[PDB]
Amino acid sequence: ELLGLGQRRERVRILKPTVAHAIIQMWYSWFVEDDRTLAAARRTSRDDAEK
Amino acid sequence: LAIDGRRMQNAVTLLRKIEMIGTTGIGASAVHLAQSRIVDQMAGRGLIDDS
């Protein structure tokens, strides 16, 4: 449907083409990484200035 | 006066000696590590926690 052109195309095949997977994957981690870190700093320092 | 001078030529010298020997570096390592446990001691409590 997003292609949504009616209705089904039978055997279109795409590569599981890479690259983005890896890149977006670093992404997944860091939004991860940092958050954890900031969160943690707010946790014990601890104390106003950081949070 | 004479007495302090002798005792404390020992005193002084031993003291200087101590400073130096301790700033040997590892020991200086002890300084960061032992501090930190003492940091824990310095930071065991909340009040103490401001390190």
Question: How close is the nearest chain B Cα to the Cα of A39, in Å?
Answer: 19
Residue A46 sits at the chain B interface (C-beta within 8 Å): yes
Say what angle helices B2-22 and B25-42 make with each other, to 10 degrees: 90
How distant is the Cα of A16 from the closest Cα of chain B, in angstroms?
A: 50
Closest C-alpha to B51, from B24, B29, B32, B25: B32
Distance between CA B2 and CA A33 in Å, rounded? 66
DSSP string, B6-50: HHHHHHHHHHHHHHHHHTSHHHHHHHHHHHHHHHHHHSSSSTTT-
Number of helices and strands (H, E) in chain A? 1, 0
Resolution limit in angstroms? 4.4
CA distance B2 to B13: 16
C-beta of residue B51 within 8 angstroms of C-beta of residue B43: yes
Chain B residues touching A47 at Cβ < 8 A: 49-50
- A46 contacts in chain B (CB < 8 Å): 49
Pairwise CA distance, residues B51 & B49, whole Å: 5
Nearest chain B CA: its distance from A23 CA (Å): 39
DSSP label at A7? Answer: S
* 3-class state of residue A9 by DSSP: coil
